[PDB]
Structures are given as structure tokens and as C-alpha cells.
Amino acid sequence: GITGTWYNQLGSTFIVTAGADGALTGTYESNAESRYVLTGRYDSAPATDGSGTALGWTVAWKNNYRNAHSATTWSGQYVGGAEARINTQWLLTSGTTEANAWKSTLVGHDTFTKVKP
Amino acid sequence: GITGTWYNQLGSTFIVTAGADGALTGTYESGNAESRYVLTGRYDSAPATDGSGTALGWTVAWKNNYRNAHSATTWSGQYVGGAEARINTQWLLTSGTTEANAWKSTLVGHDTFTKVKP
Amino acid sequence: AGITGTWYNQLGSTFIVTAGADGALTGTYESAVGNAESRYVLTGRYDSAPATDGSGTALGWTVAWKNNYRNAHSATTWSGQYVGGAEARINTQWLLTSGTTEANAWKSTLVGHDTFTKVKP
Amino acid sequence: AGITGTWYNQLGSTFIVTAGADGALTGTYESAVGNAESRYVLTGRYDSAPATDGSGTALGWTVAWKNNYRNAHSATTWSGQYVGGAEARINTQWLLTSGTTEANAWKSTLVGHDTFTKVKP
Ligand SMILES: COC(=O)c1cc(C(=O)OC)cc(-c2cc3c(=O)[nH]ccc3o2)c1
Numbered sequence: 001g002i003t004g005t006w007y008n009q010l011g012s013t014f015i016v017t018a019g020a021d022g023a024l025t026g027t028y029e030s031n032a033e034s035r036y037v038l039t040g041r042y043d044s045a046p047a048t049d050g051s052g053t054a055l056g057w058t059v060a061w062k063n064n065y066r067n068a069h070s071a072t073t074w075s076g077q078y079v080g081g082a083e084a085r086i087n088t089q090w091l092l093t094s095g096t097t098e099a100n101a102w103k104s105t106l107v108g109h110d111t112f113t114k115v116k117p
Numbered sequence: 118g119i120t121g122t123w124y125n126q127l128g129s130t131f132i133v134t135a136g137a138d139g140a141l142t143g144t145y146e147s148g149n150a151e152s153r154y155v156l157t158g159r160y161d162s163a164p165a166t167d168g169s170g171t172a173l174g175w176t177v178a179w180k181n182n183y184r185n186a187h188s189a190t191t192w193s194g195q196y197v198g199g200a201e202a203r204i205n206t207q208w209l210l211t212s213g214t215t216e217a218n219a220w221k222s223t224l225v226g227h228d229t230f231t232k233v234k235p
Numbered sequence: 236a237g238i239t240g241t242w243y244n245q246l247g248s249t250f251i252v253t254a255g256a257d258g259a260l261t262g263t264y265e266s267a268v269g270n271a272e273s274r275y276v277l278t279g280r281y282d283s284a285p286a287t288d289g290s291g292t293a294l295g296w297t298v299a300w301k302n303n304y305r306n307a308h309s310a311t312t313w314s315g316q317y318v319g320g321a322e323a324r325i326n327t328q329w330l331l332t333s334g335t336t337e338a339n340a341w342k343s344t345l346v347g348h349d350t351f352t353k354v355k356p
Numbered sequence: 357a358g359i360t361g362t363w364y365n366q367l368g369s370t371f372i373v374t375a376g377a378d379g380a381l382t383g384t385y386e387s388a389v390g391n392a393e394s395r396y397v398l399t400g401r402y403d404s405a406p407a408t409d410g411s412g413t414a415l416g417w418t419v420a421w422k423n424n425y426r427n428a429h430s431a432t433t434w435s436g437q438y439v440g441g442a443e444a445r446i447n448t449q450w451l452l453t454s455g456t457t458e459a460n461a462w463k464s465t466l467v468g469h470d471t472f473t474k475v476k477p
């Protein structure tokens with residue numbers, strides 16, 4: 001149920017393949033200048049008791065056109081059904097000097113759906 | 118650089134390779150083979166040249182051939198090179214839960230990695 | 236209109252707060268989840284002179300999960316901002332830390348996000 | 357309780373607190389220099405009847421970054437636990453939320469961690 005195209009609440013798109021070995025691979029777009037590689041992992045044998053499927057992935061914000069010197073990790077769970085969702089919290093760390101490291105990391109949350117909001 | 122064997126402050130072992138394409142690959146051990154897990158992630162392969170660190174992140178899903186915790190951790194942070202290289206991170210650990218239990222699904226913390234055991 | 240009032244989060248918890256002229260938040264919190272029963276004391280702070288450029292009003296508060304009925308040996312802090320409008324809202328992210336031994340400290344802190352409205356969802 | 361007194365974090369900040377019998381935390385948060393323009397009110401809560409099994413004491417507090425001299429339109433909450441002894445510590449994680457427009461709310465909140473000791477670093 002994970003493989004395919006997902007859309008967050010703020011206009012980003014997330015195209016992922018969930019491989020048989022637990023791999024997540026794909027592209028994240030916040031135009032080619034805005035598309036970035038993503039990789040991660042998911043539980044390939046989740047429980048069948050109503051619990052979600054744990055997963056996570058990373059995007060480093062560098063491509064052939066731009067580089068923000070930063071990276072976001074999303075940690076969350078996939079929930080299947082008629083209104084399937086991937087519910088996540090995220091951390092976005094920028095490369096900083098030591099003096100600025102205290103303010104290097106933003107935190108937030110993203111909800112992804114199989115239909116554009 | 119990033120490629121190498123790292124240890125967090127609690128003794129976990131992080132064996133990583135940073136590839137030319139921005140890929141992180143390797144294994145994470147939270148001393149036995151039953152405790153070794155696949156990791157994948159990404160890093161900035163062209164960092165700034167002003168003294169700033171190198172941003173990165175990776176994920177471990179806590180399933181291997183021997184155990185399955187139905188959970189996954191992501192680490193987000195930066196590599197700081199120099200005399201004692203370090204990777205400073207903050208992490209999120211999400212378990213698969215029912216909807217009624219989702220409010221308590223995610224733990225948060227911080228790990229610092231060096232090339233020497235604690 | 237303003238922060239003072241009774242708010243409900245997406246799970247039905249009840250947040251009764253007064254925003255004082257000196258920047259103080261005081262009131263009570265009743266949790267719809269966890270090892271909790273009845274009302275708990277909260278205190279916190281808010282920006283009593285927010286920017287005039289359309290930005291929200293920053294704030295934060297703490298509940299220690301001890302009252303006359305129960306003690307969970309834990310505390311939650313909510314950090315967020317109030318956003319005025321036709322449907323006023325307080326958007327927060329929270330940290331819930333339990334008292335633990337050192338060996339268990341790595342798993343002492345849960346994290347999440349709560350959104351509050353003056354209308355109970 | 358062991359919490360009342362002056363604490364110092366890893367980056368020079370100084371945390372001056374009174375732990376009341378009812379679970380109240382009150383005091384002042386300032387820089388290493390301690391000039392008036394760096395001092396802010398703090399309020400929070402702690403578990404006034406912690407467990408007796410060697411666990412820490414859960415607590416939290418908030419500072420809104422407004423005083424009589426400046427206003428950054430933001431607030432920080434620290435969530436953590438106090439651990440007593442000859443090397444007493446308060447180990448925390450924190451969230452710093454700035455007031456923003458809706459378009460910028462995704463980048464409103466920083467996260468980090470502070471460790472406080474009874475002696476200057
Ligand atoms: C223009 O470069 C980008 O596309 C870009 C750049 C940065 C950055 O830190 O640069 C200052 C951050 C993001 C970003 C997206 C995103 C998301 O969708 N959910 C979670 C966080 C998040 O962060 C995207």
C-alpha cells in the first residue's frame with residue numbers, strides 16, 4: 001500500500017517505491033529544479049492487528065540545480081484503508097558553524113494522502 | 118569524512134559509507150548479529166566551504182532476520198570534521214500503533230557519534 | 236477574542252487558560268489520553284505584545300501530571316502560537332518527559348503536535 | 357527537592373529558580389553576563405512527589421523572549437528531569453516557537469537539548 005504517489009498538506013509530492021527488502025526509494029518535490037532524491041526504510045512485515053506500518057526517509061536538499069546545505073528526515077507510520085495516510089513528524093537540520101549549531105534543527109509534522117488536498 | 122565506523126554515547130555502532138551520489142548505506146547495531154540492522158540515508162555531497170558542517174540523515178527500520186519491533190528511527194544532524202570528528206544528531210523513533218494509541222507513538226532524543234567507543 | 240478562554244485539542248482534551256497582562260498563562264488542563272484524571276494545574280508564558288505584521292502570538296505552558304487523584308511522574312510542555320481569525324487556533328508541538336532511571340532515560344520523552352480551537356471538534 | 361537555586365547550561369545561560377511546595381517553578385532566565393536586557397521571566401511545573409525507586413523528577417518550564425528591553429516574538433519550553441546527588445543535573449529537550457504568518461509556520465519551531473549543572477561550565 002505504500003508504493004505510489006503521495007501529497008502532503010502544503011503542496012509537496014512524494015513518489016516512492018516500497019521494495020520487498022524494506023527499502024524506500026523515490027523522489028520528493030517541494031519542475032526538475034525542485035526534485036530531490038529520497039531514500040529510507042519501512043517495516044516489511046507489519047502487524048495485522050490494526051496498527052500502522054512504521055517507516056522513515058531522508059531528503060538531502062541538493063540536486064543538480066540547487067543546494068540548501070540541509071536535510072530532512074520524516075519518521076512516521078503508514079495507515080491503510082479507504083482514506084490511507086502516512087502520518088509523520090520531521091526534523092530538518094542545516095549545516096552550521098559550531099556557534100550556530102544550537103539553532104540548526106527545525107521540527108514539524110506532515111500528513112500525506114493518496115489524493116491531492 | 119563521513120565514511121567509517123562510529124559509536125554513539127551509549128555504545129551503539131554505526132557503520133556507514135557515503136557514496137558519490139549523496140547516498141548513505143550501512144548497518145546499525147543498537148554486539149551480536151541479532152542486533153544488526155540495515156540503514157539508508159542521504160547527505161550533502163557538496164557542503165559549504167565556510168566552516169559549516171555537512172547535513173545528513175538516515176533511517177533504520179527495526180526488523181532483521183531475528184527480531185521485529187514494528188518501529189523505525191530517523192537521525193537528522195550534521196557531520197563536523199576536524200581533530201575529533203563528530204556527527205551530532207537528533208532522532209525520532211516511531212512505533213506502529215492503532216489510531217487510539219498514535220498520540221504516544223513517537224519518542225525523541227539526541228545522539229552524538231564519534232570514531233571512538235565511549 | 237484572544238488567548239484567554241476554554242480550548243479543546245483534536246483528541247478532546249480541555250485547556251482552560253487565562254492570559255494575564257504581565258505575560259502569564261494560568262489555568263487547568265484535562266487530558267483525554269494517558270494516566271490522567273480530572274484537572275491539572277498549568278502555568279506558562281506568552282508574548283503580550285506580538286508583532287503587527289500578521290504573525291501569530293508565541294506561547295508555551297507546562298503541566299506536571301500530579302493532582303489529588305493520580306501522579307504519573309511526568310510532565311508535558313506545549314510550545315506554539317495563537318493565530319487569530321474567524322476560527323481562532325493555537326498550533327503546538329509538545330514534549331512529554333517521564334521521570335526515569337538513567338538506564339531508561341533514552342526513552343523518557345514522547346513528542347507530538349496538538350491543535351486547539353475554541354470549538355470542540 | 358533539590359531544584360531551588362541557580363543552574364548553568366552548556367552554553368553559558370543561567371537559570372534561577374524556586375521550586376514551590378505545590379509544584380510551582382518560578383524564577384528568571386538570563387545570559388552568562390546577566391545584564392538586564394538578557395533577563396526574562398520563567399514559569400513552570402515539577403512533580404513535587406517523585407518516585408522513590410531512583411527515577412528522576414519530571415519538570416518543565418517556559419520563557420517568552422519578551423522583557424522591558426526587547427521582544428523576539430518567540431518562546432521556548434524545556435521538558436526534562438532533575439537528577440540529584442553530588443553531580444546534580446537537569447537534563448532537558450526544548451522547543452523554540454516563533455510567531456509567524458501561516459505561510460512561514462512550517463519553519464516556526466526549533467528543537468534542541470540543554471543540560472544544566474550547579475557549577476559554571
Ligand atoms: C528550496 O529548497 C527546498 O525545496 C527546500 C529547502 C529547505 C531548506 O531548508 O532550505 C532553506 C527545506 C525544504 C523542506 C521541505 C520540507 C517539506 O516538504 N517537509 C518537511 C520539511 C521540509 O523542508 C525544502
Ligand SMILES: COC(=O)c1cc(C(=O)OC)cc(-c2cc3c(=O)[nH]ccc3o2)c1
Nearest residue numbers: 129147152179184186188190208210212228
Ligand atoms: C532490539 O531492538 C532494538 O535494537 C531497538 C529497538 C527499538 C525500538 O524502539 O523498538 C521498539 C529502538 C532501538 C533504538 C536504538 C536507538 C539508538 O541507538 N539511537 C536512537 C533511538 C534508538 O532506538 C533499538
Ligand SMILES: COC(=O)c1cc(C(=O)OC)cc(-c2cc3c(=O)[nH]ccc3o2)c1
Nearest residue numbers: 365369387393394421428430432450452470
Ligand atoms: C538577550 O536575549 C537572550 O539572551 C536570548 C534571546 C533569545 C531569543 O530572543 O530567542 C529568539 C533566546 C535565548 C535563548 C537561550 C536559550 C537557551 O539557553 N536554551 C534553549 C534556547 C535558548 O534561547 C536567549
